[PDB]
Amino acid sequence: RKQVSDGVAHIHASFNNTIVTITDRQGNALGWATAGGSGFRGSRKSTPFAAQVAAERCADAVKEYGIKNLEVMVKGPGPGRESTIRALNAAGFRITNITDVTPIPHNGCRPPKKRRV
RNA sequence: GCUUGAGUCUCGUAGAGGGGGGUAGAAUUCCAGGUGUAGCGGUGAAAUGCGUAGAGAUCUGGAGGAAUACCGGUGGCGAAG
Numbered sequence: 653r654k655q656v657s658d659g660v661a662h663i664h665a666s667f668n669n670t671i672v673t674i675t676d677r678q679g680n681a682l683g684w685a686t687a688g689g690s691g692f693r694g695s696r697k698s699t700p701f702a703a704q705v706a707a708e709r710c711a712d713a714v715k716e717y718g719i720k721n722l723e724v725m726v727k728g729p730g731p732g733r734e735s736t737i738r739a740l741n742a743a744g745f746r747i748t749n750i751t752d753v754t755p756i757p758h759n760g761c762r763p764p765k766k767r768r769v
Numbered sequence: 770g771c772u773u774g775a776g777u778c779u780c781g782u783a784g785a786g787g788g789g790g791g792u793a794g795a796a797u798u799c800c801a802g803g804u805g806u807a808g809c810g811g812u813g814a815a816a817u818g819c820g821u822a823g824a825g826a827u828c829u830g831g832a833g834g835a836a837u838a839c840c841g842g843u844g845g846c847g848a849a850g
């Protein structure tokens with residue numbers, strides 16, 4: 653439809669769920685998928701396998717997309733932070749740079765208290 | 770009377786010692802806008818809760834508060850805090 657011919661995939665991976673969204677360099681989202689929405693409701697959605705399933709499910713259908721080269725950037729503590737890439741790269745888009753954001757707060761915003769369980 | 774206790778004077782050193790003022794980066798939250806769409810979030814597992822009145826994720830701009838990520842150590846300073 654637009655034939656971007658290049659893009660970047662933002663992965664937000666946490667201990668609870670994984671989200672993957674394809675986007676343009678100018679911050680324009682085309683599609684997204686989540687392990688929770690990929691039929692892994694419960695404890696499996698936090699597993700690496702459900703992350704790669706969502707990655708490939710979001711990467712599929714490249715015809716209308718048109719993104720040939722798809723960079724990658726991950727954020728947060730994921731289920732290895734590598735399985736999603738292992739699936740996405742084989743999905744068809746070659747990877748040349750992966751950046752990791754993982755926002756590290758330089759102090760401030762006192763974290764929540766501890767869990768006594 | 771004396772100089773060894775105590776003290777003053779000259780030249781230097783290290784240090785989160787204390788009070789006042791200024792400024793910088795990261796991150797959280799919130800507000801406005803753009804793409805986008807069915808979930809998000811949380812747990813041992815759930816639910817409440819948020820979202821089709823468009824959430825979450827993502828990009829641009831803005832407001833404001835608080836603390837200074839490594840350096841950082843069987844390091845330092847302070848009578849103690």
Ligand SMILES: [Mg+2]
Nearest residue numbers: 764765766767
């Ligand atoms: Mg918590």
Ligand SMILES: [Mg+2]
Nearest residue numbers: 775776777778
């Ligand atoms: Mg003196």
